[PDB]
Design a protein that fits this description.
monomer, binds protoporphyrin IX containing FE, binds sodium ion, Flavocytochrome C3, Chain A, domain 1, Flavocytochrome C3, Chain A, domain 2, alpha/beta, binds fumaric acid, FAD/NAD(P)-binding domain, electron transfer activity, 3 domains, globular, binds flavin-adenine dinucleotide, 23 strands
Length: 568
Amino acid sequence: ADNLAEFHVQNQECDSCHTPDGELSNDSLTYENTQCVSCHGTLAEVAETTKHEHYNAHASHFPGEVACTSCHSAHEKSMVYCDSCHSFDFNMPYAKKWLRDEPTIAELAKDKSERQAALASAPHDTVDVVVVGSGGAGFSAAISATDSGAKVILIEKEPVIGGNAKLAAGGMNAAWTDQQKAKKITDSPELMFEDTMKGGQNINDPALVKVLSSHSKDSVDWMTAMGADLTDVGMMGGASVNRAHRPTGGAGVGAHVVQVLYDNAVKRNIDLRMNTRGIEVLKDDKGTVKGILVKGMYKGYYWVKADAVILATGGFAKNNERVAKLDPSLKGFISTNQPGAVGDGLDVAENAGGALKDMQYIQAHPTLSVKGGVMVTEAVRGNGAILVNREGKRFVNEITTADKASAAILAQTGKSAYLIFDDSVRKSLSKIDKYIGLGVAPTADSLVKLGKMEGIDGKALTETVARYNSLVSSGKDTDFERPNLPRALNEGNYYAIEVTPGVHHTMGGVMIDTKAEVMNAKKQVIPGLYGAGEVTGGVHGANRLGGNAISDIITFGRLAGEEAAKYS
Ligand SMILES: Cc1cc2nc3c(=O)[nH]c(=O)nc-3n(C[C@H](O)[C@H](O)[C@@H](O)COP(=O)(O)OP(=O)(O)OC[C@H]3O[C@@H](n4cnc5c(N)ncnc54)[C@H](O)[C@@H]3O)c2cc1C
Ligand code: HEM
Ligand code: HEM
Ligand code: HEM
Ligand code: HEM
Ligand SMILES: O=C(O)/C=C/C(=O)O
Ligand code: NA
């Protein structure tokens, strides 16, 4: 067969997959996937037949109900979504190499003669709020607005939900939570505020950070009330105390949080449309939003009439060309992001009249696994790992900010460093088992062996750990002044993860006020237009603190959802 449909049509009718009229049920291909499931079983059940020791196409960390058509198209060869970050040994029938080729919003100007057509038609739907983007902000905003009584349509341009949010690992910052107090941590919203302002070099908009710190405990409560487990509280860089909340044992905060929001959305029957890209915010003749034109991958262009559009589209850290224009030093770097985190949501906010701010501050995460091409959480260092260079020496306060950590690693020989930890660190953070599973955490029972495996002087490495452990014992890092020394690295085996900075987060984005309203260049609110999450600028100034983005998208998404419901 040349394609999956052709393969099946040797012994099946078209309506084995299609509706009776043959029309695609919708852009999520809900009906069609239901047919794949009716014969092949759920994803879990498919997974059983495709196990590999350390990976499985059908049993991934992606939350929500991942459609089969996310990777298996019927009438054309299709791409494996995991190939956008990994290079696992897959043999998907009818596959084609991963290649993201999505027109920019500007390029879709080529469809004027179909967009105009769409805009002249009746709206496909009429609701109160359209939320664009199914990351943490979008889901929060959809839920929020629905809880407030608004009818929402939540759209997602990828075949899968979660954006970058589902990849999040280290934690969601919040101060003065019950979760913290359960752990004997003392903190305060003013402390979180102060950490964030200095972490962002005082570029941050103070009123936005006030929302961020003051709403954080509320955001953690809200999530917890929805089913989230944010009881593990870890240390992230640039933080005075542990406040990065995450699931018990130190599991990824992101997949979990997005999973909860998704289940909550499903429970509220929120209309969630996959393969549906927001293209252009529609304004009436008085300049308030009147809807949004979207491009359904299978239904084409259509618009939704709504009083409020909440842009929750994430950042542009995967778009290296845009990143390079704003920060020429990040050009050619690998990104930790999902494939569609390319800034099309900012273009949509900009075409609507939203002004942008702080675009030039683009965060590189210091520790992208060299081997794996994926983010290794800062929580690894927060929980006690150290960084060592090829020379086998520490060279930086590993819990400093992402900007200082990146520059320090890039100044090491080979422009990469090694996270070094033991079984005590491993065991304190379950997320580290995911890296051992990826094959990116080589291990050995001695640092000499470990260094010889990775090309780190073993004897230097061994002295470095012994030196580090002493400092942990004495309670002060006089070498690099790492202010939190949670654990000696002397339990069980030792592990090394080769790391180098990757593009990660765009701290710049659409200008919003404390009600998450998008402002134009003359600082005027554009009625009905809201922005939440990484698509906004001003929250994190020049350097976002680890944990603050997940705090931010829940806080701002919830807030946008409420404000929009209310605005109506
Ligand atoms: C690998 C990784 C791990 C991270 N770990 C952490 C962590 O522990 N703690 C932390 O604080 N931060 C962490 N971060 C940062 C944080 O996850 C992100 O900032 C991300 O969650 C921002 O959330 P968001 O809702 O704004 O956008 P995202 O979650 O990126 O979601 C936005 C959605 O919008 C969709 N979209 C975009 N444009 C359009 C359009 N025009 N139409 C329709 N849909 C559109 C995108 O496809 C995407 O799904 C991590 C980021 C990465 C990449
Ligand atoms: C878009 C929807 C579907 C997807 C993504 C899908 C997935 C797949 C794939 C990847 C294969 C292997 C093809 C090959 O080896 O060349 C396959 C085969 C098969 N499919 Fe599907 N399928 C879908 C719908 C269906 C439906 C509706 C039925 C039955 C009515 C079905 C029954 C089968 C059978 C019987 C086989 C051969 C092997 C087997 O499962 O015993 N599939 N399918
Ligand atoms: C000869 C038999 C079939 C015919 C004539 C047919 C017809 C079509 C048409 C016209 C479309 C595009 C609809 C649009 O763009 O609006 C489509 C898409 C689609 N069809 Fe089929 N179909 C057939 C069999 C199947 C089978 C056997 C499957 C799955 C095993 C399937 C699954 C799908 C899916 C998932 C889509 C969305 C796009 C894609 O993945 O290619 N169809 N089909
Ligand atoms: C219930 C949802 C899905 C169904 C029914 C389906 C169906 C299938 C089937 C029948 C096979 C052939 C494996 C075998 O049985 O020999 C397969 C293989 C495969 N599918 Fe799916 N699939 C689904 C979802 C997905 C998703 C979401 C992705 C990517 C994340 C994916 C990517 C692949 C890959 C990469 C292979 C080859 C497995 C390997 O080489 O280990 N599938 N799928
Ligand atoms: C269905 C699609 C995918 C599959 C099956 C998959 C598979 C895996 C596997 C097997 C691991 C090792 C730990 C574990 O077992 O979870 C892993 C880790 C990881 N993957 Fe994926 N991957 C997929 C897609 C992606 C994509 C598209 C990205 C980036 C956008 C990504 C980012 C990561 C990261 C950052 C890690 C490190 C551990 C963590 O944060 O949990 N994965 N993935
Ligand atoms: O877990 C991490 O390393 C990333 C955190 C962040 O980007 O906030
Ligand atoms: Na931003």
